[PDB]
Amino acid sequence: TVAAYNLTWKSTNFKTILEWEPKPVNQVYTVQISTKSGDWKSKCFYTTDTECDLTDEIVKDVKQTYLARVFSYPAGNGEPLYENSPEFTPYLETNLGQPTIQSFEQVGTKVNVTVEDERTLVRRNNTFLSLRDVFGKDLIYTLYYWKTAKTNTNEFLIDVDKGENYCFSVQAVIPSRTVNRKSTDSPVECM
Amino acid sequence: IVGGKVCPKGECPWQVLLLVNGAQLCGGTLINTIWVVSAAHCFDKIKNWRNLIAVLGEHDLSEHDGDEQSRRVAQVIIPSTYVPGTTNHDIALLRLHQPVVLTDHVVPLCLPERTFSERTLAFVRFSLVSGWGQLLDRGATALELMVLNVPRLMTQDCLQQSRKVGDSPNITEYMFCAGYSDGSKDSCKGDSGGPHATHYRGTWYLTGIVSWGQGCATVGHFGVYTRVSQYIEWLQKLMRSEPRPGVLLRAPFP
Amino acid sequence: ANAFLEELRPGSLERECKEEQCSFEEAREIFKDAERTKLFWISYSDGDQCASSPCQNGGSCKDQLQSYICFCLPAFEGRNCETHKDDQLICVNENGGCEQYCSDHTGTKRSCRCHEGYSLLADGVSCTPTVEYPCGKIPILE
Ligand SMILES: *[C@@H]1O[C@H](CO)[C@@H](O)[C@H](O)[C@H]1O
Ligand SMILES: *[C@@H]1O[C@@H](C)[C@@H](O)[C@@H](O)[C@@H]1O
Ligand SMILES: NC(=[NH2+])c1ccc(N)cc1
Ligand SMILES: [Ca+2]
Ligand SMILES: [Ca+2]
Ligand SMILES: [Ca+2]
Ligand SMILES: [Ca+2]
Ligand SMILES: [Ca+2]
Ligand SMILES: [Ca+2]
Ligand SMILES: [Cl-]
Ligand SMILES: [Cl-]
Ligand SMILES: [Cl-]
Ligand SMILES: [Mg+2]
Ligand SMILES: [Mg+2]
Ligand SMILES: [Mg+2]
Ligand code: NA
Ligand SMILES: [Zn+2]
Ligand SMILES: [Zn+2]
């Protein structure tokens, strides 16, 4: 066996996949995940994949700090060769997904712009929670229009000029973050 | 035990106090009414083999009470591969002359099946280690049974997190590290042979034996325990064996 | 794209890009500003990565830039909901749900066993003591 390397966390709206190298040659992998004081949970048993979906483990508590390790096992079946992953705190590191402008309505002399609820992989009491459900006040949405507006909800109420048709685009933002603070811009929508 | 707590009376029911000539020798773990698992190195300096006593139900060494049961050690079985003065294959299986009586204060720890131990118990983060050993590296030993919760490490991590020391023993497949590298908690010399017990789904199992370490609660070091899972077959086979005239028996391993 | 008689009208995002597929320059001619045209184009020409219906077993796809997210039904997981949680009952997966011992049986279901002093319960996974003082239990507490 050869130990996995370049273990990387790919996470968006809590969909969290651990990826690694290299492609297996006469060896299979098994992944383990845990929190600093918790027990190790096994996932992706004897897989030939070089990735492992850990979404279901991390969504149990998105604010926890998880560490994973990829075990290498020789083909056919004593501590195995393994590599530890970087630590990963979902709440602080999951990328914000690309938003979608749900609608825009000219209410009076202003335009209301509504951002579609971004659904995440966290599924409270049967349903998938939105980004706002998860982040609350930590999440704001920003609007680039033609110039910039910001909201604590999923709606913007901006002043427009009579009959001028504006164009808009929005981003999900977690202001408290130092890194990975925003999503990619939503597709542009014009009146 | 450095940095632990007193194990409340009756809460470490499988802990054994081994005495030689009436004096404190080592800890041990009751696994059934007749057998006790301890560490091989505990018998490195023994000359009076007929003077070994196993005490069950012990708690406070300064007081005797009606819960204590003493039995003569009839046999001490060590792997013939073990070398006195060294660390590898640090395990001993002792046959008591007469069985202890199981009570609320004397209960055996479950010796687990090997695979269950390797694939399941080995991944339970915390386990308890206990004994009447030193309360501080080179300090006085404890009068009341002490217990400590320690996290287990895979050997690769142990090596990577342990301070480089010239002459240090190899951490083999017959051992595992558990503890803290921060100088705050750890088992110690006098705890040798005591249990490293793992709680899983409501039942406690024997996963390790207090074996060695660089000092006790030394910065950059973890406690090293005998990996009991490597000896399951060896222990079971031997427990079905018939007594021999001499006390000490060096049995082939595997 | 062009077809002469339809090209007599002034520029229109709806006509040229929303109803028809436009080129970067057509779009640029509409937005004029580079940045404007850039953010529009970035998503417009990105493509719907969910078009290929990558999410299996009843999962739902949500498009992103050059990628997608699969939301799975409860009994599935994996990037594409390809993993059946129901086909994972093996001993390495949380002891196969067994309280004490677990035995794998390829082709058939795994079974659970107990340590001496315990017998397997009705449920086929839990263990109950058959003696007053089974190993591994602390009586003064329980
Ligand atoms: C279409 O679906 C396949 C898998 O079903 C995926 O690999 C592609 O990325 C997606 O666009
Ligand atoms: C996409 O999401 C999954 C979870 C189910 O609700 C599907 O019916 C839906 O289309
Ligand atoms: N855990 C330890 N530091 C240790 C255990 C046994 C021993 N004899 C010496 C040190
Ligand atoms: Ca006493
Ligand atoms: Ca046309
Ligand atoms: Ca056209
Ligand atoms: Ca044009
Ligand atoms: Ca043109
Ligand atoms: Ca896309
Ligand atoms: Cl949202
Ligand atoms: Cl006796
Ligand atoms: Cl020491
Ligand atoms: Mg149109
Ligand atoms: Mg055109
Ligand atoms: Mg042009
Ligand atoms: Na230490
Ligand atoms: Zn007692
Ligand atoms: Zn006594």
Q: Given CB atoms, is C99 within the 8 Å cutoff of chain B?
A: yes
Using a CB–CB cutoff of 8 Å, tell me whether C90 touches chain A.
Answer: yes
Residue C1 resides in a domain = no
Cα C75 → chain centroid? 11
Domain residue ranges of chain A, discontinuous segments joined by + = 1-93, 94-191
Q: How were these coordinates obtained?
A: X-ray
Which residue, among A42, A31, A141, A128, has the nearest Cα to A83 in the 3D structure? Answer: A31
Evaluate the omega torsion of the peptide bond into residue A22 and state whether it is cis, within 30 degrees of 0. yes
Q: Which residues of B touch C140 (CB under 8 A)?
A: 9-11, 13, 104-105
What values do phi and psi take at B246, rounded to 5?
-80, 160
Peptide bond into B254 cis (omega under 30): yes
Q: Which residues of A8-34 are buried (b: 16+ CB within 10 A; e: fewer)?
A: ebebbbbbbbbbbeeebeebbbbbbbb
| CA angle B166–B169–B170, rounded 5-degree value | 115
For an interface test with B, the pick among A31, A40, A71 (most B C-beta atoms closer than 10 Å) comes out as A40
Q: Which of B78, B94, B83 is nearest to B29 (CA)?
A: B94
Q: What are phi and psi of B38, to 5 degrees?
A: -145, -165
Interface A-C: count of C-beta contacts within 8 A: 62
Q: What are the structural domains of chain B?
A: 1-12+109-229 (2.40.10.10), 13-108+230-243 (2.40.10.10)
C4 assigned to some structural domain: no
- Residue C22's domain comprises 12-142
C5 inside domain: no
- Write the CA distances from B11 to A151, B198, B204, integer angstroms: 57, 14, 12
Query: How many other CB atoms are found less than 10 A from the CB of residue C121?
Result: 13
Show the tokens assigned to B100: 């202890």
Length of chain A: 191
The rounded distance, in Å, linking the Cα atoms of C99 and C94 is 10
Fold observed for domain A94-191 = Immunoglobulin-like (2.60.40)
Q: Is C65 on the interface with A (CB under 8 A)?
A: yes
Rounded to an integer, what distance in angstroms lies between the CA atom of residue B164 and that of residue B156? 14
Question: Cα–Cα–Cα angle for A54, C107, A55, nearest 5°?
Answer: 5
Task: Describe chain B by its helix, strand, coil percentages, rounded to 5.
Answer: 15, 35, 50
Distance A26 CA to ligand 1 centre (A): 27
Q: How far apart are CA B106 and CA B11, in angstroms?
A: 10
Per the rule left: phi > 0, alpha: psi between -120 and 50, beta: everything else, A93 is alpha
> Is B186 annotated in some ligand binding site?
yes
Q: Which amino acid is at C7?
A: E
Is the C-beta atom of C73 inside 6 A of ligand 2?
yes
Q: Ligand 3 atom 6: the closest Cα is on which residue?
A: B212
- How many domains are there within chain C? 1
CA–CA dist B56, B67 (Å, integer): 8
Is residue C104 domain-resident?
Answer: yes
Q: Give the integer Cα–Cα distance in Å for C136 and B205.
A: 6
The alpha carbon of A100 and the centre of ligand 13 are apart by a number of angstroms equal to: 19
A94-191 has the same fold as A1-93 = yes
Residues of B serving a catalytic function are: 41, 90, 192
Put simply, whether B205 touches C (Cβ < 8 Å) is yes
Whether the CB-CB separation of B145 and B24 falls below 8 Å is answered with: no
Binary contact (C138, B10; C-beta < 8 A)? yes
CB–CB of A184 and C40 under 8 A?
A: no
Q: Whose CA is nearest to atom 8 of ligand 2?
A: C58
Distance from the A42 Cα atom to the nearest Cα atom in chain B, whole angstroms: 9
Q: Judge whether C50 lies within some domain.
A: yes
Closest atom of ligand 3 to B179 CA is: 1
Are B177 and B223 spatial neighbours (Cβ–Cβ below 8 Å)?
A: yes
Q: What residues contact residue C23 under an 8 Å CB cut-off, 6+ apart?
A: none
Fold of the CATH domain A1-93: Immunoglobulin-like (2.60.40)
**Minimal CA–CA distance to C10: which of C30, C24, C27?**
C30
Give the end-to-end CA distance of chain C in Å, rounded to a whole number: 80
